[PDB]
Design an enzyme around this catalytic site. Structure first.
Site, PDB file in Angstrom:
ATOM      1  N   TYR A   1       0.824  -1.203   0.000  1.00 27.04           N
ATOM      2  CA  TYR A   1       0.000   0.000   0.000  1.00 27.04           C
ATOM      3  C   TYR A   1       0.862   1.258   0.000  1.00 27.04           C
ATOM      4  CZ  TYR A   1      -3.742  -3.245   1.250  1.00 27.04           C
ATOM      5  OH  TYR A   1      -4.545  -4.177   1.263  1.00 27.04           O
ATOM      6  N   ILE A   2       1.709   1.388   1.015  1.00 26.75           N
ATOM      7  CA  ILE A   2       2.394   2.651   1.238  1.00 26.75           C
ATOM      8  C   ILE A   2       3.650   2.766   0.377  1.00 26.75           C
ATOM      9  CG2 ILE A   2       1.548   2.920   3.585  1.00 26.75           C
ATOM     10  CD1 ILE A   2       3.889   1.534   4.636  1.00 26.75           C
TER      11      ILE A   2
END
Ligand SMILES: Nc1ncnc2c1ncn2[C@@H]1O[C@H](COP(=O)(O)OP(=O)(O)NP(=O)(O)O)[C@@H](O)[C@H]1O
Ligand SMILES: [Mg+2]
Lengths: 49, 44, 98, 49, 457, 98
Positions: free
Chosen positions: D46-47
């Site tokens: 995600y990040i």
DNA sequence: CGCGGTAGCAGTAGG
DNA sequence: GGATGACGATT
DNA sequence: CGCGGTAGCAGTAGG
DNA sequence: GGATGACGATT
């Protein structure tokens, strides 16, 4: 007990201080004394930790 | 003495002496019981 | 060292936590306040109401009963709301240049 | 394991009060919050950083 | 444990004669021996006991021999005065007569060394026939009481004493050997061997940390514990009376062991189990002596004597409990061991479910990323009217799904509890819900669209 | 809530301790449930765990009943002598399961 | 989509 | 006054 | 170090 | 004769 007794932390500090580089278990012995296993292999782990 | 040790009582006398097997204990008893609460109109 | 958050009285029987000791997470104080609000099997409820109003900052709005106000005054505001944390430099260990 | 390393990175990036006085990496995403001490953080896929 | 078919009445009248011989040990501590001879072929039963016998003497009030009085007439007993705290089994003065009444033949034979005489009297036809006693000189011989009866099998609906009723009667003799102190019991001229209540409890070893945990708490209480297989089981004895249904005494013991365990399980870890779950994993053995006990009926299967009248107390030690906790029973209980507390992640809107349940909005999020973003949004839109909960993953398609699969899915259930949702009837207004609005937060990718679809579905 | 409970009546006699009739009813509901729980999924629970989550109300009429004592708190009349039978339907069990 | 287990030390907090 | 838990890089 | 949940289709196997 | 499960890329 020197290795796995929570009560001995300092004892392990000194224990690590004592260890001499190059001190490793004999590659070919087919007989491993526990004391040696603790002072020649596990200690390596601790150091790494 | 052997006539005071062994007694024979009537049926009416046994009831008043040992009520438990007829009507139940005559001693007060701590119990968890259901009651009707007139205020809330329900069992409790 | 000691490390204090910030608790302030913003009304009659109303406190407000605007800051917590560093490394003291919001969910911890949250569970704490929830326990203080809904009581417990081992401890009686001592908080009347609690609300969260966190922006880019910590806001806890707490409402106690006057009794709990006096009691809390006796215990100490920061001491009872877990707004004090110790910092120990006694264990500073690192590998020297060698 | 790459997992431990990913966590090391996330740790280097976290920017919530009480983490890194100077984050050497930028938390481009949900790199955790002060609400749980960075534990909230999202998965590596995600990040970004 | 064997499945059997017996006539309780028959078994009981036999118990009434046994318990009478056991009572005699309380009367005369110098007793040593009890014989029980079952002649199945002749449907005849003999119960003999040494020690002091029946006084051979004319009762000053009833004007008949004492033996004839206490064995031939109803309501006759030595246990009628309760000023003296006795630990005998006899309480009501029926059991000898109840055996006589049920018997085609009943014979009493006793030796009294005080008068140096032997006494033999025979009843017949359900105690309706009473033959005059034959009294003879009895010198230089031991005193004893020997009861021999032939059960009225026709009344019990039996043509003979079949293996089932026999096997039970025999085990009731082993009971006596175990529950009575310092006696020797013989079954048809054969010693039963066991000497104390522990020896007795160990007979159940092969059926049942050890397997049996015994102790003696005091002069009047002996307790043994074993882990039960299916449910709670109890084998208790109040004054050598087989209290098969239990009562106040059994509960007095179990109510402790269950109480103390619960505190220990609860104290160490949260969620400690309901009382019944602890009790129904126990086997409890009890051998006690209660002062002037009281029962539910003459059969004395259930003690009702309040604890405070026991004439003694039994405090189960902590050491005992910590040993029970060393058996499987412990590892068994460990196996079992407006706002919402049910769901941690849930950021419940401050007003949620409250008079403003219709105003507030619940925000469902795809993943903890979306979740984090939403909780961040709370810091902008205020908590009072906004909450959020993270959907785990692809949601469960509810149609073409078993009610059980839906019930089992913790994720849908959580949703139904957070929103205050029920299927009942047709939803007219939000008014009944915790929240009045539901907002969907998906990453804005195709899978997100799918999630929205599953939510709508 | 806590354990098995029963309120039964044999001919307008408050059988507070239960007996053969109570068991006759409970032994069914526990039996049928166990099969249903066991059949659908493995590991079905011990009988006592099912029974001790029930409250059972019973109002029945037994022919020439027999009890433990004159107080008549516990019926002992064998099921086959009831003078009638009570077969708990499947529909009933499926509602308990709701 | 997400949850859980363990080591290793120093000190704090909870009962 | 002993126990439990937090923290973090690694299995 | 490891475990678990869900979608979506066609056909097979199990009671 | 209806139910459950396998397979696989993705949450
Ligand atoms: N073998 C015996 N030795 C001495 N006394 C006896 C013997 N058998 C019976 N008795 C006495 O005879 C009386 C009547 O016996 P019984 O009918 O069994 O009454 P009980 O045992 O005292 N009351 P219960 O046990 O409830 O029936 C009792 O009081 C006994 O004391
Ligand atoms: Mg008797």
């Amino acid at each position: 007990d020197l290795a796995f007794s929570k009560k001995k932390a300092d004892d392990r500090k000194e224990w690590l201080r004592q260890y001499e580089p190059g001190t490793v278990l004999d590659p070919t012995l087919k007989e491993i004394p526990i004391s040696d296993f603790i002072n020649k292999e596990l200690i390596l782990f601790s150091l790494a930790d | 003495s052997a006539s005071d040790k062994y007694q024979k009582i009537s049926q009416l006398e046994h009831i008043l002496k040992r009520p438990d097997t007829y009507i139940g204990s005559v001693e007060t008893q701590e119990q968890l019981q259901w009651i009707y609460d007139e205020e809330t109109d329900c069992m409790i | 060292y000691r490390m204090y958050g910030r608790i302030e009285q913003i009304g009659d029987n109303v406190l407000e936590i605007t800051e917590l000791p560093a490394r003291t997470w919001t969910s911890t104080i949250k569970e704490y306040l929830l326990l203080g609000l809904s009581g417990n099997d081992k401890i009686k409820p001592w908080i009347k109401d609690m609300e969260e109003q966190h922006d880019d900052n910590i806001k806890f709005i707490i409402t106690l009963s006057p009794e709990e106000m006096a009691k809390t005054r006796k215990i100490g505001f920061y001491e009872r709301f877990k707004l004090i944390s110790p910092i120990s430099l006694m264990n500073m260990v690192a590998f020297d240049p060698h | 394991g790459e997992q431990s390393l990913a966590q090391t990175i996330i740790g280097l990036a976290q920017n919530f009060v009480g983490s890194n006085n100077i984050y050497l990496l930028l938390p481009n995403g949900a790199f955790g919050t002060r609400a749980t001490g960075g534990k909230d953080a999202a998965a590596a896929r995600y990040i970004y950083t | 444990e064997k499945n059997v078919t017996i006539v309780p009445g028959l078994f009981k009248i036999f118990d009434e004669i046994l318990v009478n011989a056991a009572d005699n040990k309380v009367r005369d501590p110098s007793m040593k021996r009890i014989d029980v001879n079952i002649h199945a072929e002749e449907h005849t039963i003999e119960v003999k006991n040494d020690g002091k016998g029946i006084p051979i003497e004319i009762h000053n009030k009833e004007n008949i021999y004492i033996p004839e009085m206490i064995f031939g007439h109803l309501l006759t007993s030595s246990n009628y005065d309760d000023d003296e705290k006795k630990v005998t089994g006899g309480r009501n003065g029926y059991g000898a007569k109840l055996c006589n009444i049920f018997s085609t033949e009943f014979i009493l034979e006793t030796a009294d060394l005080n008068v140096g005489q032997k006494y033999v009297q025979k009843w017949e036809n359900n105690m309706s026939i009473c033959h005059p006693p034959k009294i003879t000189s009895y010198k230089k011989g031991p005193s004893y009481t020997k009861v021999t009866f032939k059960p009225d099998l026709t009344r019990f609906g039996m043509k003979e004493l079949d293996n089932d009723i026999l096997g039970v009667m025999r085990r009731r003799v082993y009971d006596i050997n175990g529950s009575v102190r310092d006696i020797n019991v013989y079954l048809n001229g054969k010693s039963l061997k066991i000497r104390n209540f522990k020896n007795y409890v160990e007979l159940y070893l092969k059926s049942l940390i050890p397997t049996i945990l015994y102790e003696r708490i005091n002069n009047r209480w002996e307790v043994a514990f074993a882990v039960s297989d299916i449910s709670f089981q109890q084998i208790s004895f109040v004054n050598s009376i087989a209290t098969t249904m239990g009562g106040t005494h059994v509960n007095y013991i179990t109510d402790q062991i269950v109480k103390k365990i619960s505190e220990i399980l609860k104290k160490k870890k949260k969620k400690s189990v309901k009382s019944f779950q602890i009790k129904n994993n126990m086997f409890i053995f009890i051998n006690c002596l209660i002062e002037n006990p009281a029962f539910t009926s003459q059969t004395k299967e259930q003690l009702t004597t309040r604890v405070k009248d026991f004439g003694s107390r039994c405090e189960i030690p902590l050491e005992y409990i910590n040993k029970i906790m060393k058996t499987d029973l412990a590892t068994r209980m460990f196996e079992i061991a407006s706002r919402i507390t049910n769901y941690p992640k849930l950021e419940d809107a401050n007003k949620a479910g409250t008079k403003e349940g219709y105003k507030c909005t619940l925000v469902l999020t795809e993943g903890d990323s979306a979740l984090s973003l939403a909780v961040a949004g709370l810091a902008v839109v205020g908590r009072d009217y906004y909450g959020c909960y993270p959907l785990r993953g692809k949601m469960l398609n509810v149609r073409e799904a078993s009610a059980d699969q839906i019930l089992k899915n913790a994720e849908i259930q959580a949703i139904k509890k957070i929103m205050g949702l029920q299927h009942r009837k047709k939803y007219e207004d939000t008014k009944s819900l915790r929240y009045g609005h539901l907002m969907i937060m998906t990453d804005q990718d195709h899978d997100g669209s799918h999630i929205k679809g599953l939510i709508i579905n």
